[PDB]
Design a protein around this ligand. Structure first.
Ligand SMILES: Cc1cc2c(cc1C)N(C[C@H](O)[C@H](O)[C@H](O)COP(=O)(O)OP(=O)(O)OC[C@H]1O[C@@H](n3cnc4c(N)ncnc43)[C@H](O)[C@@H]1O)c1[nH]c(=O)[nH]c(=O)c1N2
Ligand code: HEM
Ligand code: HEM
Length: 399
C-alpha cells in the first residue's frame, strides 16, 4: 500500500514542526497549552504561501500547496478559539489583551470571507486577504509585549519561537511586497496577437533573457500597459525555447476578456518562473492525453516543441463543436507529419461528451489530463474504475 509518497516530504514539514513544538513545550515549559501549536501553524502558513519552489517540490504542486495552506489556517483559527477561551473576558485590560483580540477580529473576518469572497471576484480578495498580515503583526506584539524575558533567552522555547516566527515574518514580508517584484523580473516584450474563436487569444513573446522550463509546466504573467491590471495570473505555455515564448488564453472573466479584445500589440511583460508537475518528458514510454478544449494549451506546447514524439501517444480532445473548436488545423498538421501519434477529436455537440466504460487503453501508459475541473475529476474517477494498474495524472485550473 503506497498512498502519497512524494507529498509526504511536504507533510513531514508540517508534522515535524508541530511535534518539535510540542515536545519542546511539554518537557521544558508548557505554560500555554494551545498557542505554541497555533503559532507554528501560522509559521507554516506563511511558509507555504511563499510559492517557494523547494517546498513546491516537497508538497508536490500548487494545488497541493494551497490545499495545505488551508489545512494549517483551519487548525490555527480553531485553536485561537480555545486560546480566546483561555482568556475568559474578550475586551480585557486592553493593555495587551485587546491586541490579541483585535488581531483575531480581523483574522476571523477575512478567513470567514474565504468561502464567500472566493465566490465572486478575487481581485478584491487579493487586497483584503493581505490585510491578514497587519493582523499577524498585532498578534506578534501581543505575545512579545507579554513574554519579553523568555523570548530573549537561550531556552529552546526561545529559539524555536525566534526561528519559526522569523521564517513566517520573512516569508510574510516577502510575499506581501517582494514576490511580485523579485520574481516577475524575467523580462519580456509581446510579439504577435492572434484571434481564435471568441474563447481564445494566443500571444507570442520575446525575452530579454532566454528561458527554460520542463515540457508541460506553467507560469504566472504580469504586464505593464494602459489601464491593464498587471496582477500575475496562471498560464500554461503554448510555446517556448530560448529567447522565445507563446501563451494561449480562453476569455474567462474580466481580465482575460481584457486581453482577448484589448491587448495593445506592444507591451512590457514579466514572468515569475516555471512550476507544476505535468512533466510530459518524465512520463512513461506510453502517454495518453485528455484535453478539455479551452484548456489544451500544455499539450500544444509539447507538440510545438520537439517535432518528433518521444514514443507513441494516444490523444483525445473535447471541444463541443467547431463553434468552440480551436487549434484544429495546427493539430492536423501534427497528425499528417507524425505517424507515431494517435488522435481523437470530439464535438460533444453531436452524440455528446466522452465516457471510458466502453474504452480500453494500454495500462502501461501514463495518462495526462487537463480540463475544466468538473470533467477532469469525473473522468479520473471512471478511469480509476477501469484500472488501478494504469498510471493517471489529472489537473483542473483553480487555487
Ligand atoms: C496551473 C494553471 C495554469 C493555467 C491556468 C490556471 C492554473 C491554476 N489558467 C487559468 C487562468 O488563471 C484564467 O483563465 C485567467 O487568469 C482568468 O483571470 P480573470 O481575472 O479573467 O478571472 P475571473 O475571476 O474574471 O474568471 C476567470 C476564472 O479564473 C480564475 N482565476 C484566474 N486567475 C486567477 C488568480 N490569479 N487567482 C484566482 N483566481 C484566478 C478565477 O477565480 C475565475 O474562476 C489558464 N488560463 C489560460 O487561458 N491559459 C492557460 O494556459 C492557463 N493555465
Ligand atoms: C482557511 C484559511 C485560508 C484561506 C481559505 C486562504 C485563502 C487564500 C487564497 C484564495 C489566496 C490567493 C492564492 C494566491 O494566489 O496566493 C491566499 C493567498 C495568501 N494567503 Fe491565504 N488563506 C488562508 C489562510 C492563510 C493563512 C493562515 C496565512 C498566513 C499565516 C495566509 C497567507 C496568505 C498569503 C501570504 C497569501 C499570498 C498573498 C499574495 O501575495 O498574493 N493564508 N490565501
Ligand atoms: C482575542 C484573542 C486573544 C486574547 C483575548 C488573548 C488573551 C491573552 C491573555 C490575557 C494572555 C495573558 C496575558 C494577559 O492577560 O495580559 C495571553 C497570552 C498569550 N497568548 Fe493570547 N490572546 C489572544 C490571541 C492569541 C493568539 C492568536 C495567539 C497565538 C497565535 C496567542 C498566544 C498567546 C501566548 C503565546 C501567550 C503567552 C505564552 C508565552 O508567551 O509563552 N494569543 N493571551
Amino acid at each position: 500500500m503506497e498512498f502519497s509518497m512524494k507529498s509526504v516530504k511536504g507533510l513531514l514539514f508540517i508534522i515535524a514542526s508541530f511535534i518539535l513544538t510540542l515536545l519542546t513545550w511539554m518537557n521544558t515549559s508548557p505554560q500555554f497549552m494551545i498557542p505554541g501549536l497555533a503559532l507554528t501553524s501560522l509559521s507554516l502558513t506563511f511558509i507555504l504561501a511563499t510559492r517557494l519552489p523547494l517546498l513546491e517540490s516537497w508538497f508536490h504542486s500548487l494545488e497541493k500547496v494551497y490545499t495545505v495552506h488551508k489545512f494549517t489556517a483551519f487548525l490555527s483559527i480553531i485553536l485561537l478559539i480555545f486560546h480566546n477561551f483561555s482568556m475568559g473576558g474578550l475586551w480585557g485590560s486592553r493593555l495587551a489583551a485587546q491586541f490579541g483580540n483585535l488581531a483575531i477580529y480581523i483574522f476571523a473576518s477575512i478567513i470567514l470571507v474565504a468561502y464567500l469572497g472566493k465566490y465572486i471576484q478575487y481581485e478584491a480578495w487579493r487586497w483584503i486577504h493581505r490585510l491578514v498580515y497587519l493582523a499577524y503583526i498585532l498578534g506578534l506584539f501581543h505575545i512579545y509585549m507579554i513574554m519579553g524575558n523568555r523570548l530573549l533567552t537561550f531556552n529552546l522555547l526561545s529559539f524555536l519561537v525566534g526561528s519559526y516566527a522569523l521564517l513566517g515574518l520573512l516569508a510574510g514580508f516577502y510575499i506581501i511586497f517582494l514576490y511580485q517584484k523579485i520574481s516577475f523580473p524575467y523580462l519580456g516584450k509581446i510579439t504577435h496577437l492572434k484571434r481564435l474563436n471568441h474563447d481564445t487569444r494566443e500571444i507570442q513573446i520575446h525575452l530579454s533573457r532566454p528561458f527554460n522550463y520542463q515540457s508541460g509546466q506553467f507560469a504566472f504573467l504580469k504586464i505593464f500597459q494602459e489601464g491593464f491590471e498587471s496582477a500575475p495570473h496562471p498560464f500554461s505555455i503554448s510555446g517556448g525555447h530560448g529567447q522565445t515564448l507563446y501563451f494561449t488564453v480562453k476569455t474567462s472573466g474580466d481580465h482575460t476578456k481584457n486581453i482577448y479584445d484589448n491587448l495593445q500589440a506592444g507591451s512590457k511583460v514579466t514572468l515569475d518562473r516555471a512550476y507544476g508537475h505535468m512533466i510530459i518528458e518524465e512520463g512513461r514510454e506510453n502517454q495518453v492525453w485528455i484535453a478539455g478544449g479551452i484548456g489544451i494549451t500544455p499539450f500544444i506546447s509539447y507538440i510545438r516543441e520537439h517535432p518528433i514524439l518521444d514514443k507513441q501517444v494516444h490523444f483525445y480532445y473535447s471541444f463541443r463543436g467547431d463553434e468552440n473548436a480551436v487549434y484544429l488545423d495546427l493539430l492536423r498538421n501534427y497528425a499528417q507529419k507524425n505517424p507515431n501519434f494517435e488522435l481523437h477529436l470530439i464535438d460533444s455537440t453531436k452524440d455528446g461528451y466522452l465516457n471510458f466504460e466502453q474504452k480500453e487503453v494500454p495500462e502501461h501508459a501514463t495518462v495526462y489530463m487537463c480540463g475544466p475541473i468538473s470533467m477532469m475529476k469525473a473522468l479520473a474517477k471512471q478511469i480509476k474504475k477501469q484500472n488501478p494498474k494504469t498510471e493517471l495524472i489529472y489537473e483542473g485550473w483553480k487555487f
